[PDB]
Design a protein around this ligand. Structure first.
Ligand SMILES: [Mg+2]
Lengths: 414, 428
């Protein structure tokens, strides 16, 4: 019967589609700033029989019996998260980054109260106040932005807005910003007006883990994150913070927002948190940051500047480069389509270019120099662009750094 | 590099705990009614490289490049759900049963508006209006229950409550009820008072798929479910319903409630929906139902009655049995602990007008889906029923050793996941 039959026998169309997606990941150059590649050991945990266990509640205080082994798993994930980030408390049950943020706002505020965050047009996430999301539907929203001249967040301007609006919760965090936030200034402003401070570090958490971006943990009431993105793990969420919020946050995740947690995915969170403390992971983060600096420099060279293309803030200190196309012949969709022709996946008069996934695959400075030159030539040279010559150079790079070499022979366990 | 190193090398403590949990599943008899066992093909989908893809939006309308293959995967899951259940639209993105219900309420009502559902004390779920869940925090709540004599939902009483309370949304659905809901009566009441009708079929979806429980789909505006529980798939949610509600429900899932979907888990949903249309799966549901009737019949016998034990509603028509213990020496927690000693996993459950506190109770909920998946039929269910009845009826003379030996004999005769240690991530 079908309980022990391979996927190839049970569902031939899904088996073929898994093979096609693996091929696409191997053949293309992935430069979406929010994406990465999980290690073999995380695939194994996500494919485990822990999916079968119902574990509503917390370790040692569950609805049902038989949780002895999954309770040790959840405690390894909590205790590794506290140690890696230097936090007082952790909850490792959120299903996603969005579900982590819904639980934090449930714990710290009530419907109708005031929420202050970074504007969508200026680099914020949809969970920081967008009108159709829970963050906009339930709460009264105010926003801060970036200085129009420097393109940096001006903390004197944030201060004046907070004193006027008097928010209950202030969010620091972003989906598209190219520099380092001042967490000590955010703490000072929240204290003045009696607000709680949430930092949403989803994009930059792996930089924090390796010691290459300043930590928000000393300064924040609560910190939310994805375990995917720069942290390099399986698709899910996580919360850490000060001890005084432990009961508020636990009760908001369950039974506030969720039912049963995904215990196979929590096992993978413990694995990713162990990898994130290693010297190998720290070097990978350094190759990420050096690649982003190499691309930003190449796009500020005379040929690109003359075509009307500019780099937002004049550089980067993080894992991505933000590009403004409004004075060039290209719009965002046209630039995205042209890069697809030469084998590169990015996202959109703006364009965002990221380096985490290529660093994980093994690219260093020589390789990022070649990738930057391919992009610059496409954006600068207009009608005279040789798509075919640029595609062959991209496929040469991909072929030289194999992805998931040997996956076709790997076991579920052992 | 650690990118290609096995789990046993990278994290020996976690590898060891995976092997201990597999052994616990093999050695016990699982009878929690919300539990089941996924097939090999679903383990392989959930362990796939599809975890790496960002895919916010819907097929053909995404916010990221490179989604050509994951768009085909999502459309196979949507099309198989519509065909299996006879529904006009499907959304296959919800992360869980709770997340499916949060999106439905976001689409159909506004904060402060009125919600009517089955009480927790009478077998409802916490997402049907419990005070400290979203369903109680955001909305004004009213409840219906079961009759104190018959233990059934009385639709004349549900109608009277709906006429007085005038809800915006009525929920029909349960976590612990032993009989068949009257969906045509719920539609009539909703139409009378101008309410929308949500059916939450999480517990009984696999019975509906096999044609062995009447379908809510012709009668409901929207239907929510888990893909785990009787449907037999990986841990996740699903929504199906009338085309009238498609645009609002899609917008409520994203950007209303969620961000990126879990594409590896959605591949596994497509696999579980294909299995659920097969004759093999229909036979498994027939064995689930026949096994539960055998357990109820054995408990309704002179030895068990004389010990102070009865069956709620005097029987069952679904995948579970509700036991009433209040005239016996055992409270619900005590009975749950005794059965664990003899190798069987169940959970405590509140009875009608229960005299004990809600965290202790005077009852049990006993389920058959997980053991039917493992291969049990009528012969095996007759033996487990006798083990349970003997434990509950013999008082201080119970022989735990003799009963535990009978349970482990059944576990060894029906191996679970035999050969898993040799199976590959991809291929055969
Ligand atoms: Mg309305």
């Amino acid at each position: 019967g079908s309980m022990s039959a391979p996927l190839a026998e049970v569902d031939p169309d899904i088996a073929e589609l898994l093979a096609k997606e693996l091929g696409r990941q191997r053949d293309t150059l992935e430069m979406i700033a929010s994406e990465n590649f999980v290690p073999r050991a995380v695939l194994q945990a996500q494919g485990s029989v822990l999916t079968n266990k119902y574990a509503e509640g917390l370790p040692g205080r569950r609805y049902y019996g038989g949780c002895e082994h999954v309770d040790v798993v959840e405690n390894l994930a909590r205790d590794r998260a506290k140690a890696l980030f230097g936090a007082e408390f952790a909850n490792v049950q959120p299903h996603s980054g969005a579900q982590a943020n819904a639980a934090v706002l449930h714990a710290l505020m009530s419907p109708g109260e005031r929420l202050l965050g970074l504007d969508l047009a200026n680099g914020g996430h949809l969970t920081h106040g967008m009108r159709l999301n829970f963050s906009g539907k339930l709460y009264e929203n105010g926003f801060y932005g970036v200085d129009p001249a420097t393109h940096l967040i001006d903390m004197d301007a944030v201060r004046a807005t907070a004193l006027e609006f008097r928010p209950k919760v202030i969010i620091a965090g972003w989906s598209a910003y190219p520099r380092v936030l001042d967490f000590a200034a955010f703490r000072s402003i929240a204290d003045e007006v009696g607000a709680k401070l949430l930092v949403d570090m989803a994009h930059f958490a792996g930089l924090v883990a390796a010691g290459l971006h300043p930590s928000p943990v000393p300064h924040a009431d609560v910190v939310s994150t994805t375990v995917h993105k720069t942290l390099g793990g399986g698709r899910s969420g996580l919360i850490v913070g000060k001890q005084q919020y432990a009961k508020a946050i636990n009760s908001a995740v369950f039974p506030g927002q969720q039912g049963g947690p995904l215990m196979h995915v929590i096992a993978g969170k413990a694995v990713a948190l162990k990898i994130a403390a290693t010297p190998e992971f720290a070097d990978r983060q350094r190759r990420t940051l050096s690649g982003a600096r190499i691309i930003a420099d190449r796009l500020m060279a005379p040929d690109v500047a003359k075509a009307g293309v500019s780099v937002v803030s004049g550089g980067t200190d993080v894992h991505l480069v933000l590009v403004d196309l409004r004075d060039s012949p290209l719009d965002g969709q046209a630039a995205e389509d042209l890069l697809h022709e030469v084998g590169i996946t990015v996202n959109r008069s703006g364009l965002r270019i990221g380096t985490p996934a290529l660093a994980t695959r093994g690219f260093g400075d020589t390789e990022f120099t070649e990738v930057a030159d391919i992009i610059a030539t496409a954006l600068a040279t207009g009608s005279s662009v040789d798509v075919s010559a640029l595609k062959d150079r991209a496929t040469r790079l991909a072929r030289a750094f194999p992805l998931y070499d040997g996956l076709e022979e790997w076991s579920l366990v052992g």
